[PDB]
Amino acid sequence: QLKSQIQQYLVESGNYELISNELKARLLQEGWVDKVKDLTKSEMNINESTNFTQILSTVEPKALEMVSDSTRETVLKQIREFLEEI
Amino acid sequence: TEETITIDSISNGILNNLLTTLIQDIVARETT
Numbered sequence: 001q002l003k004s005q006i007q008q009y010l011v012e013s014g015n016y017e018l019i020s021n022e023l024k025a026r027l028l029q030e031g032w033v034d035k036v037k038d039l040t041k042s043e044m045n046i047n048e049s050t051n052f053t054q055i056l057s058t059v060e061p062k063a064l065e066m067v068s069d070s071t072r073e074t075v076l077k078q079i080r081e082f083l084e085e086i
Numbered sequence: 087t088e089e090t091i092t093i094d095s096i097s098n099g100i101l102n103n104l105l106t107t108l109i110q111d112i113v114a115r116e117t118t
Contacts, residue, residue, distance in 0.1 A: 023104050033112060040116040052117040056110065063109045064102070072101070079097045 008086070015082045022078060026071040036063055 027033055036059070043058045044050050 019100075020104050020107075023101075024108065027108070033108075036109065036112050037116060040113050044116070050117060052114055055117055056113050059113055060106070060109050064105055067105060075101055075104075076097055079100050083093070083097050083100075 012082070012086060015085065019075065019078055019082055023071070023075045026074065027067065030068055030071070032066065032068065032071075035066070039063065 039062070040055065040059050043055055047054065047058065049055065
């Protein structure tokens with residue numbers, strides 16, 4: 001039916017993974033990861049609980065806001081290449 | 087109305103997943 005259809009998806013799987021790799025690099029290069037670590041411990045001190053779910057809700061919303069402007073656009077460009085492929 | 091912007095919103099969504107994964111990984115490591 002569609003042997004070649006199968007071929008396309010492996011290229012995409014390799015690209016999505018590719019996109020995830022490069023994103024981690026920009027944030028890590030920016031020390032964004034180092035700031036998030038500091039933010040998690042700050043919220044663990046502020047709140048009695050050290051629970052993952054309770055700590056995740058306080059830290060995550062702000063962390064999404066924190067990502068640099070340049071990182072968003074570049075990754076969105078790369079996500080556009082991937083998205084446009086299919 | 088190509089509504090091509092809603093294809094663009096899908097690109098942004100994907101990004102938000104990749105971000106939530108990393109945020110979860112970083113928070114979870116410090117927890118426990």
